Amino acid sequence: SLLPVPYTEAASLSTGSTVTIKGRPLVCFLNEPYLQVDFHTEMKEESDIVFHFQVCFGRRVVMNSREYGAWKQQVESKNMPFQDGQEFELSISVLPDKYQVMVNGQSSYTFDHRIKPEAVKMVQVWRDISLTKFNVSYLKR
Amino acid sequence: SLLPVPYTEAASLSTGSTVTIKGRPLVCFLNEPYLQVDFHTEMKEESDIVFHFQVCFGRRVVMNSREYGAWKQQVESKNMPFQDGQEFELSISVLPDKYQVMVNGQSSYTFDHRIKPEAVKMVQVWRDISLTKFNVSYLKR
Numbered sequence: 001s002l003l004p005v006p007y008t009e010a011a012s013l014s015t016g017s018t019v020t021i022k023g024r025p026l027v028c029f030l031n032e033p034y035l036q037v038d039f040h041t042e043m044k045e046e047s048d049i050v051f052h053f054q055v056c057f058g059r060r061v062v063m064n065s066r067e068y069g070a071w072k073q074q075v076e077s078k079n080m081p082f083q084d085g086q087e088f089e090l091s092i093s094v095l096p097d098k099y100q101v102m103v104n105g106q107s108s109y110t111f112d113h114r115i116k117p118e119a120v121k122m123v124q125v126w127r128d129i130s131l132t133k134f135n136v137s138y139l140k141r
Numbered sequence: 142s143l144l145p146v147p148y149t150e151a152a153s154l155s156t157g158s159t160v161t162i163k164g165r166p167l168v169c170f171l172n173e174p175y176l177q178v179d180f181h182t183e184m185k186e187e188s189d190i191v192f193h194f195q196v197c198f199g200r201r202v203v204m205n206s207r208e209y210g211a212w213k214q215q216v217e218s219k220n221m222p223f224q225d226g227q228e229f230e231l232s233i234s235v236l237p238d239k240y241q242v243m244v245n246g247q248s249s250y251t252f253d254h255r256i257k258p259e260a261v262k263m264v265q266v267w268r269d270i271s272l273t274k275f276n277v278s279y280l281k282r
Contacts, residue, residue, distance in 0.1 A: 006167060026147060030187050046171050
């Protein structure tokens with residue numbers, strides 16, 4: 001819809017930053033659509049990924065990092081706040097120790113920093129969703 | 142690009158029919174983009190799937206059927222004719238005994254019929270690709 005997908009935006013993150021994504025799955029949960037949010041170290045898509053967040057709607061969520069071209073230890077969660085056929089609001093806060101992910105205002109996942117958030121230069125949002133809003137909070141120093 | 146994705150087209154199949162799909166992966170193989178082709182029994186996406194063909198570019202291909210809302214025996218292949226960053230041409234022929242899938246003119250996968258091809262009423266092509274051409278051969282009786 002509003003924003004093109006894959007959506008790529010240059011970005012800078014530090015403690016206190018928040019990334020807000022508003023969108024909607026393209027198909028019903030029965031068909032297992034995915035949503036993926038990757039925080040990259042460079043503007044190119046083949047670059048390293050500081051924080052990989054992949055949702056298989058209705059099934060599970062996978063988080064990881066890709067360092068020096070290699071995927072590290074995957075963390076898997078079965079927590080599923082997303083609602084079939086509904087628009088969702090996803091907020092990723094950068095805390096000192098980890099990323100906190102809220103879905104529709106509810107804390108749902110956390111991921112301890114493996115690489116400093118300051119290494120992030122780009123965020124890519126893709127897979128089976130329509131994207132209506134993308135915002136990174138640049139109020140803090 | 143040319144055609145919207147998810148792409149849905151009402152269709153009828155029988156022995157001798159061919160479905161030709163031309164497109165291109167949206168991102169590099171390193172990021173594991175997917176391609177999915179589902180032959181449905183009804184015009185709705187939650188309907189049964191006579192033939193499910195899902196490609197995880199660079200990794201594997203999964204084939205199955207969803208009957209009465211339940212996924213059946215999955216068949217997995219590691220055969221991978223698709224080329225990173227290239228446009229592909231995918232042809233699915235309906236033979237008496239099975240579907241034959243050609244990738245860029247090379248026979249690559251087959252799937253024995255679980256349900257008669259005549260039960261198909263719709264084809265949906267989706268996931269991480271841009272679609273330039275979609276055609277079903279309606280020359281045969």
